[PDB]
Amino acid sequence: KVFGRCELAAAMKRHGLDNYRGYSLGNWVCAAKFASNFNTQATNRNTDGSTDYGILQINSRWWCNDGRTPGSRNLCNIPCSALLSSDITASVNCAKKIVSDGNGMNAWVAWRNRCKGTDVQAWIRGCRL
Ligand SMILES: [Cl-]
Ligand SMILES: [Cl-]
Ligand code: NA
Incomplete structure (x- = not known):
């Protein structure tokens, strides 16, 4: 599914990501926009052999099993x-474990490089939430 911006904002809000560990909703929407362009089906393979999956591009070396990333956790x-x-539930649930890990949202390269330190509230502007 390719989400609209406000539709994803609303879905993330319902699943408890607004201010989860201190990160306002705009952060999560911005990270999804630059990680997957809001497409739940996005995959990208990395040079180490791991692959990133889904709306928030969660990586197979640590977080999920894809049967082809050896010695993954x-x-x-x-x-x-x-x-x-x-349905983004599995993605959200896994993201909550990642962001609780120590490095916060710095675990997402697209967030750190394109969202961090920007006016992230812009991402939820106009939405009925
Ligand atoms: Cl925000
Ligand atoms: Cl980047
Ligand atoms: Na794995």
């Missing part, structure tokens, strides 16, 4: 395919 205890669903 499934800390979210989920097949990576679960992260490509039109």
Whole structure:
């Protein structure tokens, strides 16, 4: 599914991401926009052999099992395919474990390089929330 900006904002809000660990909703929407262009089916393979999955581009070396990333750790205890669903629940649940890990949202390269330190509230401007 390719989300609209406000539709995803609303879905993330319902799943408890607004101010989760201090990160306002705009941060989460910005990170999804630059990680996947709001497409739940996005995949990108990395040079280390791991692959990033879904709306928030969660990586198979640490967080999910895709059966082809050797010595990977499934800390979210989920097949990576679960992260490509039109229902974002699995993605949100796994993201909450990632952002709690120590480095906050710096775990997402697209967030750190394109969202961090920008006016992230712009991403939820206009939305009924
Ligand atoms: Cl915000
Ligand atoms: Cl980047
Ligand atoms: Na893994």
